[PDB]
Amino acid sequence: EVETFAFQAEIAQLMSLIINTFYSNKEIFLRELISNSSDALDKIRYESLTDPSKLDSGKELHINLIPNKQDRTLTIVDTGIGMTKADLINNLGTIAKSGTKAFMEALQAGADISMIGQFGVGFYSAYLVAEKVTVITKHNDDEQYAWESSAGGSFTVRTDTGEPMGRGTKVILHLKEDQTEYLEERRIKEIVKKHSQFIGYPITLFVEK
Numbered sequence: 001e002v003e004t005f006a007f008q009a010e011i012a013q014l015m016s017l018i019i020n021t022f023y024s025n026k027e028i029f030l031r032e033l034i035s036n037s038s039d040a041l042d043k044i045r046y047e048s049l050t051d052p053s054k055l056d057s058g059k060e061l062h063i064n065l066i067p068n069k070q071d072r073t074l075t076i077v078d079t080g081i082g083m084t085k086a087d088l089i090n091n092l093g094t095i096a097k098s099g100t101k102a103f104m105e106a107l108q109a110g111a112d113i114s115m116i117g118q119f120g121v122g123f124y125s126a127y128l129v130a131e132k133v134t135v136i137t138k139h140n141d142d143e144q145y146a147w148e149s150s151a152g153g154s155f156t157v158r159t160d161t162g163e164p165m166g167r168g169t170k171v172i173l174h175l176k177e178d179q180t181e182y183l184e185e186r187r188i189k190e191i192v193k194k195h196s197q198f199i200g201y202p203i204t205l206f207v208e209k
C-alpha cells in the first residue's frame with residue numbers, strides 16, 4: 001500500500017532550487033542532517049527527563065554514518081524521537097512553507113545555500129548530493145513508515161516492512177553518480193570534524209569490507 005503525495009508548491013520550488021542552482025559547497029548536506037539528528041535526539045532526551053519509559057524503545061542516543069559503495073548510499077541513522085506518519089507528510093516535521101519563504105528572501109538578500117539550516121528546512125539539502133532520498137522513521141506513538149522522493153514534485157509514504165527500528169530516523173541518500181566522494185572514509189571524517197565537532201552525541205562512522 002503505497003500512497004503518493006504532491007509536494008506543496010513552495011517545497012517543490014525549494015527542491016528544484018537546491019537541485020538546479022550551481023553551488024559547489026555541497027558538503028554542508030551532512031552538517032544539516034547531523035544537526036537534524038541532534039535536534040531529534042534532544043527531543044527524546046527531554047521527554048525522558050520526566051517519563052523514563054519513553055526510552056523503552058531504545059536507551060542509546062547516538063548518530064551512525066553508514067556508507068555503502070556497492071549500493072552507492074550514505075545512511076544517517078539516529079535514535080531520536082522519530083516522526084509520525086503525520087509528521088512525514090507534513091514536510092518531515094518542519095514548517096517548510098514559511099521556512100522556504102524566509103530562505104528565498106535571504107538568498108536574494110545575499111545569503112547562500114549553506115545557510116539553509118537557519119530556516120528550518122536543512123533536510124532538503126540532501127538533494128545537493130542525492131538523486132533519491134528514503135526516510136525510515138519510528139516514533140513512539142506510531143508505526144514504522146518509509147518516506148521517499150526523487151524530487152519531481154511528489155513523494156511516497158508506505159508502512160515499512162523492513163528491519164524494525166525501535167525508535168528514531170534513518171535517512172538513506174541514494175547519491176548522484178558524480179557525488180561518490182561522500183562514501184569515502186577520509187572525506188566523511190573531514191566533513192564531520194569541520195562542521196559537527198560540537199554535536200553532543202557520539203557520531204560513529206561505519207567502515208566497509
Ligand SMILES: NS(=O)(=O)c1ccc2[nH]c(=O)oc2c1
Nearest residue numbers: 006007012151152153154155
Ligand atoms: N506540482 S504538481 O502539479 O503537484 C505535480 C506534477 C507532476 C508530477 N509528477 C510527479 O511525480 O509529481 C508531480 C507533481
